[PDB]
Design a protein around this ligand. Structure first.
Ligand SMILES: NCc1cccc2c1OCCCO2
Ligand SMILES: [Ca+2]
Length: 223
């Protein structure tokens, strides 16, 4: 997250870190046995780390649980990042508590200008690299579909939305991928892609989770 703040330990209790020997993407806990992340985050051998704040120090509220299965959306297209969503099942259920909590799925898509919270352990530099050890947060509004599609002509699909600041400064960035965009208590977005971070007229692009609720519920219920 560029231009954001330190969240505060366990303040975003549905944020998980996906680890494969190191942090590589975020995700969101949607019930005790399932996480939703970006399909572009797929790899074999994922460990889900829940209850993290500093991802480099055991602080005493973590749960580390290996994935038993990954399910990439059936229409994920890695060339265009259309349908950039995946499901991850945990080998054993997470222990739900104040610091390890699920985030509700949306029932309709959210309006332009709705305020959202975006979080993750990604790069905090818009030019340069610096990775934070503690979870960072950003409040960002959903941008109109028209200003999203003007920002990235030819590349925004009905399954994507932009959130951020056209002026720049304040955006998600590398290593935030797969993590949550929560709006009015609902998981509305998954960190997906963009052009650099925090550049003028290049806001973050997010997987539009409201389009996927039936797939998410049917897939979980069948697996
Ligand atoms: N700024 C949105 C954004 C979000 C996640 C990863 C990114 C990214 O920007 C593209 C360059 C870094 O990869
Ligand atoms: Ca930790």
């Amino acid at each position: 997250i560029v231009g954001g703040y330190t969240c505060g330990a366990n303040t975003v209790p549905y944020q998980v870190s996906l680890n494969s020997g190191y942090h590589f993407c975020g995700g969101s806990l949607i019930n005790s046995q399932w996480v939703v992340s970006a399909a572009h985050c797929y790899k074999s051998g994922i460990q889900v780390r829940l209850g993290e704040d500093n991802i480099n120090v055991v602080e005493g509220n973590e749960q580390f649980i290996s994935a038993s299965k990954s399910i990439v959306h059936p229409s994920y297209n890695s060339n265009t990042l259309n349908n950039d969503i995946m499901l991850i099942k945990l080998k054993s259920a997470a222990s739900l508590n104040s610091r390890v909590a699920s985030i509700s799925l949306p029932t309709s898509c959210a309006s332009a200008g709705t305020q959202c919270l975006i979080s993750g352990w990604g790069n905090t530099k818009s030019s340069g690299t610096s990775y934070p050890d503690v979870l960072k947060c950003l409040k960002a509004p959903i941008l109109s579909d028209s200003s999203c599609k003007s920002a990235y002509p030819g590349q925004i699909t009905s399954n994507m939305f932009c959130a951020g600041y056209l002026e720049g400064g304040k955006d998600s960035c590398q290593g935030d991928s797969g993590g949550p965009v929560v709006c009015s208590g609902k998981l509305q977005g998954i960190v997906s892609w963009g052009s650099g971070c925090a550049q003028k007229n290049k806001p973050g692009v997010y997987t539009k989770v409201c389009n996927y609720v039936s797939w998410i519920k049917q897939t979980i219920a069948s697996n």
